[PDB]
Design a protein around this ligand. Structure first.
Ligand SMILES: [Mg+2]
Ligand SMILES: [Mg+2]
Ligand SMILES: [Mg+2]
Ligand SMILES: [Mg+2]
Ligand SMILES: [Mg+2]
Ligand SMILES: [Mg+2]
Ligand SMILES: [Mg+2]
Ligand SMILES: [Mg+2]
Ligand SMILES: [Mg+2]
Ligand SMILES: [Mg+2]
Ligand SMILES: [Mg+2]
Ligand SMILES: [Mg+2]
Ligand SMILES: [Mg+2]
Ligand SMILES: [Mg+2]
Ligand SMILES: [Mg+2]
Ligand SMILES: [Mg+2]
Ligand SMILES: [Mg+2]
Ligand SMILES: [Mg+2]
Ligand SMILES: [Mg+2]
Ligand SMILES: [Mg+2]
Ligand SMILES: [Mg+2]
Ligand SMILES: [Mg+2]
Ligand SMILES: [Mg+2]
Ligand SMILES: [Mg+2]
Ligand SMILES: [Mg+2]
Ligand SMILES: [Mg+2]
Ligand SMILES: [Mg+2]
Ligand SMILES: [Mg+2]
Ligand SMILES: [Mg+2]
Ligand SMILES: [Mg+2]
Ligand SMILES: [Mg+2]
Ligand SMILES: [Mg+2]
Ligand SMILES: [Mg+2]
Ligand SMILES: [Mg+2]
Ligand SMILES: [Mg+2]
Ligand SMILES: [Mg+2]
Ligand SMILES: [Mg+2]
Ligand SMILES: [Mg+2]
Ligand SMILES: [Mg+2]
Ligand SMILES: [Mg+2]
Ligand SMILES: [Mg+2]
Ligand SMILES: [Mg+2]
Ligand SMILES: [Mg+2]
Ligand SMILES: [Mg+2]
Ligand SMILES: [Mg+2]
Ligand SMILES: [Mg+2]
Ligand SMILES: [Mg+2]
Ligand SMILES: [Mg+2]
Ligand SMILES: [Mg+2]
Ligand SMILES: [Mg+2]
Ligand SMILES: [Mg+2]
Ligand SMILES: [Mg+2]
Ligand SMILES: [Mg+2]
Ligand SMILES: [Mg+2]
Ligand SMILES: [Mg+2]
Ligand SMILES: [Mg+2]
Ligand SMILES: [Mg+2]
Ligand SMILES: [Mg+2]
Ligand SMILES: [Mg+2]
Ligand SMILES: [Mg+2]
Ligand SMILES: [Mg+2]
Ligand SMILES: [Mg+2]
Ligand SMILES: [Mg+2]
Ligand SMILES: [Mg+2]
Ligand SMILES: [Mg+2]
Ligand SMILES: [Mg+2]
Ligand SMILES: [Mg+2]
Ligand SMILES: [Mg+2]
Ligand SMILES: [Mg+2]
Ligand SMILES: [Mg+2]
Ligand SMILES: [Mg+2]
Ligand SMILES: [Mg+2]
Ligand SMILES: [Mg+2]
Ligand SMILES: [Mg+2]
Ligand SMILES: [Mg+2]
Ligand SMILES: [Mg+2]
Ligand SMILES: [Mg+2]
Ligand SMILES: [Mg+2]
Ligand SMILES: [Mg+2]
Ligand SMILES: [Mg+2]
Ligand SMILES: [Mg+2]
Ligand SMILES: [Mg+2]
Ligand SMILES: [Mg+2]
Ligand SMILES: [Mg+2]
Ligand SMILES: [Mg+2]
Ligand SMILES: [Mg+2]
Ligand SMILES: [Mg+2]
Ligand SMILES: [Mg+2]
Ligand SMILES: [Mg+2]
Ligand SMILES: [Mg+2]
Ligand SMILES: [Mg+2]
Ligand SMILES: [Mg+2]
Ligand SMILES: [Mg+2]
Ligand SMILES: [Mg+2]
Ligand SMILES: [Mg+2]
Ligand SMILES: [Mg+2]
Ligand SMILES: [Mg+2]
Ligand SMILES: [Mg+2]
Ligand SMILES: [Mg+2]
Ligand SMILES: [Mg+2]
Ligand SMILES: [Mg+2]
Ligand SMILES: [Mg+2]
Ligand SMILES: [Mg+2]
Ligand SMILES: [Mg+2]
Ligand SMILES: [Mg+2]
Ligand SMILES: [Mg+2]
Ligand SMILES: [Mg+2]
Ligand SMILES: [Mg+2]
Ligand SMILES: [Mg+2]
Ligand SMILES: [Mg+2]
Ligand SMILES: [Mg+2]
Ligand SMILES: [Mg+2]
Ligand SMILES: [Mg+2]
Ligand SMILES: [Mg+2]
Ligand SMILES: [Mg+2]
Ligand SMILES: [Mg+2]
Ligand SMILES: [Mg+2]
Ligand SMILES: [Mg+2]
Ligand SMILES: [Mg+2]
Ligand SMILES: [Mg+2]
Ligand SMILES: [Mg+2]
Ligand SMILES: [Mg+2]
Ligand SMILES: [Mg+2]
Ligand SMILES: [Mg+2]
Ligand SMILES: [Mg+2]
Ligand SMILES: [Mg+2]
Ligand SMILES: [Mg+2]
Ligand SMILES: [Mg+2]
Ligand SMILES: [Mg+2]
Ligand SMILES: [Mg+2]
Ligand SMILES: [Mg+2]
Ligand SMILES: [Mg+2]
Ligand SMILES: [Mg+2]
Ligand SMILES: [Mg+2]
Ligand SMILES: [Mg+2]
Ligand SMILES: [Mg+2]
Ligand SMILES: [Mg+2]
Ligand SMILES: [Mg+2]
Ligand SMILES: [Mg+2]
Ligand SMILES: [Mg+2]
Ligand SMILES: [Mg+2]
Ligand SMILES: [Mg+2]
Ligand SMILES: [Mg+2]
Ligand SMILES: [Mg+2]
Ligand SMILES: [Mg+2]
Ligand SMILES: [Mg+2]
Ligand SMILES: [Mg+2]
Ligand SMILES: [Mg+2]
Lengths: 137, 122, 204, 52, 117
RNA sequence: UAGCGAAAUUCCUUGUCGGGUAAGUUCCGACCUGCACGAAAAGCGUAACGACCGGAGCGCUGUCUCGGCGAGGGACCCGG
RNA sequence: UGUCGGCUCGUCGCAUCCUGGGGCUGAAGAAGGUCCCAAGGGUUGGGCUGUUCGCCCAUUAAAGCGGCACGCGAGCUGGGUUCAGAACGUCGUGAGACAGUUCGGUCUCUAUCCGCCACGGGCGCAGGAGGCUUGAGGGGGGCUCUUCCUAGUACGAGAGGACCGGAAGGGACGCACCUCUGGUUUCCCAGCUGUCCCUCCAGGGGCAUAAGCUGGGUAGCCAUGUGCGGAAGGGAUAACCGCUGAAAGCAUCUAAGCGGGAAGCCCGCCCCAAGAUGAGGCCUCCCACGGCGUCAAGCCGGUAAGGACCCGGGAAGACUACCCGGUGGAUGGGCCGGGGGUGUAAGCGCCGCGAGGCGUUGAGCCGACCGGUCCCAAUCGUCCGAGGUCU
């Protein structure tokens, strides 16, 4: 009995592992399986991760973009059986965790407020192709 | 979630730029209305010589909302504004081409015209 | 009429096909039938289920004799499922199969001495235009000389919650015999680590 | 003085009745291993001492 | 009702934090201290975390204790005599015996906070 | 008489017409059958001024749909 | 014996607004008219006015009427109405005056009894005890719409358009829940400004509220979020429809008798409930007298099964009660691990004149959640508790 939580964690096996690291303050696009009529699309959603809300499994994260003049925000269960892929598309200096502040002034300002994590970025490309060397060769 | 007195943004060339909600047209006493719902509304401001005038009492359908809507698959979605498209009493969109994204719920609700005319459907 | 004891462990969500489903994790741990109740000598039919093991240190009570008269390991808690005569041994989450539906009883969370505002979801009075000492108050509670009293039943502030609560027709989503877990559609009374009985519904 | 006010002098009986549960109870004391004196349970006390 | 939560206390935000500081200081000055069972039971933990922090070393943790306590001379006593004593002992640097005697003229039950040994 | 007029004066009265509103017994323009304005108990008008009284719009918000949580001083429990 | 209106909370009637049932129809169908049965539940939001009333906007299944001191001011408000001020019209020589207008104008912290909402103490339940039930009696709830199929069928010239039966989704409401959504989270973290201080730099503390401010936030609590309910089904019945049927050769639903028949009645569902003194029932445990009372029911100190006190505590809680734990122990505190929150601590090295920047580093800190470990503390102990009436 003593592990009422560990018990919960056992119900968890619906959890994914493939999906990549990505922390708030850096853009990324998720591929979402969608039901157009009856068949199934794979609508993409590219935008900035506005807030990651950690809670082990069922931790969620939220993306923000501006399709056609209107700003739009989506939320995804980090372990949803409906996220085909999720490619990171750029990384930036956060300096904060939850960052809804980007809402009330997005533009040339939103840029020069999340420059580029040339730190993490270099870990990206480097350990990216590097670890690829050790599986190519 | 829209309710009476709420100002919507008009998402089409209806001619109208803004309308206030008069009645949420669900049940006999619905508190609010979200995407896919229809509402009676007043044209509180509108473009010159447009197809619709200020004070025109009209029906429309919510297509974008500040309060997030929950998809059955656990996902959610919200827009930066509350928007709606003015419609026929036949429930067909008066003005032609609409602009700004729209919610997928309109699909399940049977507004093919608008989801068609949509620049994008999130 | 199936029935089985358990404890509310907590709750999260799982995905059915491609659509998320909120669920509470009951734990219908092994329950040894400790006594049968027949009309022959009880007047009614039911089954004394036991639940959760116990160190003989507290069982010092001659309860040991009750558990003895049935050769069972002395449990901690035991309650009856009515009109349910199993077979002469032990019930499991197995009595329930996925897709079945269940009624569930529990002791709601204790909200203590409650404001009528919350106890009965009243509406009290104006946050503003006057009186200011009657905000969360009930207002009138009767009429003049006639009747001249107050109805037995009048909704008034008092102890709210910690009562017995049965919630109806939950669907049994999953059942993991491996570790004695019942998976239902979330809405189940009591707090985590709380005791709770679960049984067949009355759709018919 | 203001609004609510007792209608009738409380009966001297009805009074003492209200005092039904007013009586006190003796403090719970116990002999200690140290001195022969009396302590309340779970309490270090003078003429005695303790151990850790 | 509230309380489903955790912890307890009278007074208010500042005055209450300051209470713990002032009590810890004196506990770390005299080792033994007598106050009301409650204050004692609370002060209990607050102190330990301090002791156990001084049980560590980095001036970091030094400065961290330097926050609640304020006397430099006093923090030395903590690192250079208190912490040493309690090395090789996981927590519990603090004991709380219930006093058998009530404060007069307020009926308050007293008790005993003491640096364990 | 001039001027003014459903008025801090209009009973019928929410008078009629127009403006404002989705919808206006209020407000504002107008007409005049003024129950019962009217010329120093002054008539009409007037920039500015007003913790005076009326109507409207923007802004903003627990005023409200409709409540929730939280803090301290009471209220509760023990001693005086 | 405080008077209108509003607000809060309602509850009852039924002469029924809606949903249910039914006869007649100038009822083809759909829709409607009208009468009869039928309170179970339901009976929206805004403009105008102090308003009640009413007109109007937009909806609805519908936007019922009325009683309860025109319910409800020791509950609230105080726009109107009824004081003192001031004014207009208006009457009066005047002082003043007007169901004529107009602006202003002090609604009382403590509930004794009944009643009500909750929660305890006592005694009882003719042995003492631990646990588990029965359900007499009672309470809660009882709403409804839309689309799809049957069927573009019956019906109708057509335009329209069903019964019956079946599926799907929605409004309001109610119980419960924190997974998700979303709030708060008063010191969990971070940043910022003035100042005063430790200790000169760095680092840090107080105060700026009862958090100085700002950004963000777990558990808990919660609604905007989640799940579930209204039935189904059995019985009796209303208006009504009908069988068999006489008085009264026929005829008649009735007089004997029988079947059909409502959101309604009884049950069924959820909650309370043996102070149901008519104190129920089942499983298990304890068991004689040991001493005065001869006769009789009593009395006394010791007892048993057991319980209590005390202490550590708890999604229990005003208090008490309820519940768990008490070393044979993981009950609270501490420590440790995880979860979570914040978002690269300090110190040092490097770059820059400098503010700063970069590495170390997802670092440091770290409440409430999940769990581990006897370091801390629940030590030691005391008191009560049958010996079981008679037929
Ligand atoms: Mg707006
Ligand atoms: Mg205009
Ligand atoms: Mg208009
Ligand atoms: Mg107009
Ligand atoms: Mg989706
Ligand atoms: Mg979907
Ligand atoms: Mg068109
Ligand atoms: Mg969808
Ligand atoms: Mg359509
Ligand atoms: Mg398109
Ligand atoms: Mg027993
Ligand atoms: Mg039952
Ligand atoms: Mg039954
Ligand atoms: Mg079985
Ligand atoms: Mg007032
Ligand atoms: Mg006032
Ligand atoms: Mg007041
Ligand atoms: Mg007042
Ligand atoms: Mg007052
Ligand atoms: Mg009264
Ligand atoms: Mg009476
Ligand atoms: Mg098996
Ligand atoms: Mg197993
Ligand atoms: Mg007492
Ligand atoms: Mg000693
Ligand atoms: Mg705790
Ligand atoms: Mg202070
Ligand atoms: Mg302060
Ligand atoms: Mg001190
Ligand atoms: Mg002192
Ligand atoms: Mg700590
Ligand atoms: Mg050091
Ligand atoms: Mg000093
Ligand atoms: Mg003239
Ligand atoms: Mg007029
Ligand atoms: Mg004038
Ligand atoms: Mg008018
Ligand atoms: Mg007009
Ligand atoms: Mg007009
Ligand atoms: Mg005028
Ligand atoms: Mg006249
Ligand atoms: Mg004249
Ligand atoms: Mg004159
Ligand atoms: Mg004159
Ligand atoms: Mg003048
Ligand atoms: Mg003038
Ligand atoms: Mg002027
Ligand atoms: Mg003035
Ligand atoms: Mg002046
Ligand atoms: Mg207005
Ligand atoms: Mg302006
Ligand atoms: Mg405004
Ligand atoms: Mg408080
Ligand atoms: Mg209290
Ligand atoms: Mg008191
Ligand atoms: Mg009738
Ligand atoms: Mg009639
Ligand atoms: Mg009807
Ligand atoms: Mg018809
Ligand atoms: Mg009819
Ligand atoms: Mg008036
Ligand atoms: Mg209305
Ligand atoms: Mg009424
Ligand atoms: Mg009258
Ligand atoms: Mg009358
Ligand atoms: Mg009245
Ligand atoms: Mg009053
Ligand atoms: Mg009044
Ligand atoms: Mg009144
Ligand atoms: Mg006033
Ligand atoms: Mg007025
Ligand atoms: Mg007045
Ligand atoms: Mg006067
Ligand atoms: Mg005169
Ligand atoms: Mg008159
Ligand atoms: Mg007035
Ligand atoms: Mg004034
Ligand atoms: Mg007045
Ligand atoms: Mg007061
Ligand atoms: Mg009072
Ligand atoms: Mg009383
Ligand atoms: Mg109770
Ligand atoms: Mg007592
Ligand atoms: Mg009692
Ligand atoms: Mg009954
Ligand atoms: Mg009933
Ligand atoms: Mg009832
Ligand atoms: Mg009722
Ligand atoms: Mg068809
Ligand atoms: Mg046809
Ligand atoms: Mg067809
Ligand atoms: Mg046709
Ligand atoms: Mg035909
Ligand atoms: Mg035909
Ligand atoms: Mg035709
Ligand atoms: Mg047709
Ligand atoms: Mg649907
Ligand atoms: Mg939280
Ligand atoms: Mg400072
Ligand atoms: Mg200092
Ligand atoms: Mg100071
Ligand atoms: Mg100082
Ligand atoms: Mg201060
Ligand atoms: Mg803040
Ligand atoms: Mg926030
Ligand atoms: Mg709700
Ligand atoms: Mg809703
Ligand atoms: Mg039900
Ligand atoms: Mg429902
Ligand atoms: Mg339903
Ligand atoms: Mg139902
Ligand atoms: Mg039947
Ligand atoms: Mg029948
Ligand atoms: Mg009968
Ligand atoms: Mg016939
Ligand atoms: Mg015959
Ligand atoms: Mg005859
Ligand atoms: Mg015959
Ligand atoms: Mg008969
Ligand atoms: Mg029958
Ligand atoms: Mg029948
Ligand atoms: Mg019961
Ligand atoms: Mg019982
Ligand atoms: Mg009886
Ligand atoms: Mg014996
Ligand atoms: Mg004898
Ligand atoms: Mg004798
Ligand atoms: Mg205790
Ligand atoms: Mg306690
Ligand atoms: Mg115990
Ligand atoms: Mg003991
Ligand atoms: Mg624990
Ligand atoms: Mg704990
Ligand atoms: Mg920890
Ligand atoms: Mg965990
Ligand atoms: Mg972690
Ligand atoms: Mg983390
Ligand atoms: Mg750094
Ligand atoms: Mg720092
Ligand atoms: Mg650093
Ligand atoms: Mg340099
Ligand atoms: Mg780490
Ligand atoms: Mg460290
Ligand atoms: Mg660390
Ligand atoms: Mg940690
Ligand atoms: Mg801290
Ligand atoms: Mg160990
Ligand atoms: Mg006999």
């Amino acid at each position: 009995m003593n592990r009422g939580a560990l018990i919960k964690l056992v119900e968890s096996r619906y959890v994914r592992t493939d999906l990549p690291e990505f922390r708030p303050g850096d853009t990324v696009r998720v591929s979402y399986k969608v039901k157009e009529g009856n068949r199934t699309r794979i609508q993409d959603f590219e935008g900035i991760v506005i807030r990651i809300r950690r809670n082990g499994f069922n931790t969620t994260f939220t993306v923000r973009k501006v399709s056609y003049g209107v700003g739009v925000e989506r939320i995804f269960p980090l372990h949803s059986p409906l996220i085909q892929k999720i490619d990171i598309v750029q990384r930036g200096r956060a300096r904060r965790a939850k960052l809804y502040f980007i809402r009330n002034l997005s533009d040339r300002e939103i840029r020069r407020k999340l420059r580029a994590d040339r730190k993490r970025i270099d870990k990206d490309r480097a350990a990216e192709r590097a670890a690829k060397e050790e599986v190519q060769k | 979630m829209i309710q009476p007195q709420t100002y919507l943004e008009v998402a089409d060339n209806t001619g109208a730029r803004k309308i206030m909600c008069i009645r949420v047209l669900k049940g006999s006493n619905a508190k609010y209305a979200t995407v896919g719902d229809v509402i009676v509304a007043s044209v509180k401001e509108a473009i010159p010589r447009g197809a619709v005038k200020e004070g025109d009492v009209v029906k429309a359908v919510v297509v974008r909302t500040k309060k997030e809507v929950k998809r059955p698959d656990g996902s959610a979605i919200r827009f930066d504004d509350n928007a709606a498209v003015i419609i026929n009493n036949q429930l067909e969109p008066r003005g032609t081409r609409v602009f700004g994204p729209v919610a997928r719920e309109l699909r399940e609700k049977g507004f093919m015209k608008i989801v068609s005319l949509a620049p994008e459907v999130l | 009429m199936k029935g089985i004891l358990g404890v509310k462990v907590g709750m999260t969500r799982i995905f059915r096909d491609d659509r998320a489903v909120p669920v509470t994790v009951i734990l219908a741990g092994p329950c040894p039938v400790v006594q049968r109740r027949t009309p022959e000598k009880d007047g009614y039919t039911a089954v004394q289920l036991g639940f959760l093991p116990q160190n003989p240190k507290r069982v010092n009570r001659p309860l040991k004799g009750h558990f003895a008269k049935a050769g069972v390991e002395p449990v901690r808690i035991l309650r009856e499922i009515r009109d349910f005569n199993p077979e002469g041994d032990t019930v499991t989450v197995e009595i329930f199969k996925p897709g079945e539906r269940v009624d569930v009883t529990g002791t709601s969370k204790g909200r203590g001495f409650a404001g009528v505002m919350k106890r009965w979801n009243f509406a009290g009075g104006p946050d503003s235009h006057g009186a200011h000492k009657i905000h969360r108050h009930p207002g009138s509670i009767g009429n003049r000389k006639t009747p001249g009293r107050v109805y037995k039943g009048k909704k008034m502030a008092g102890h709210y919650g910690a009562e017995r609560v049965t919630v109806m027709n939950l669907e049994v989503v999953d059942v993991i015999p491996e570790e004695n877990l019942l998976l239902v559609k979330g809405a189940v009374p009591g707090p985590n680590g709380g005791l709770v009985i679960v049984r067949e519904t009355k759709k018919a | 003085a203001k609004h609510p006010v007792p209608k009738k002098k409380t009966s001297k009986a009805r009074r003492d009745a209200r005092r039904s549960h007013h009586a006190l109870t003796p403090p719970i004391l116990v002999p200690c291993p140290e001195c022969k004196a009396m302590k309340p349970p779970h309490t270090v006390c003078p003429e005695c001492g303790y151990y850790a | 009702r509230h309380l489903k939560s955790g912890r307890k206390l009278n007074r208010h935000s500042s005055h209450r934090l300051a209470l713990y500081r002032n009590q810890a200081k004196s506990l770390l000055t005299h080792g033994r201290i007598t106050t009301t069972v409650p204050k004692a039971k609370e002060l209990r933990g607050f102190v330990d975390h301090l002791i156990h922090l001084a049980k560590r070393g980095d001036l970091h943790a030094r400065r961290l204790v330097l926050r609640d306590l304020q006397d430099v001379k006093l923090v030395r006593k903590l690192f250079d005599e208190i912490a040493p004593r309690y090395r090789d002992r996981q927590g519990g640097y603090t004991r709380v015996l219930k006093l058998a005697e009530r404060r007069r003229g307020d009926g308050a039950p007293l008790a005993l906070v003491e640096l364990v040994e």
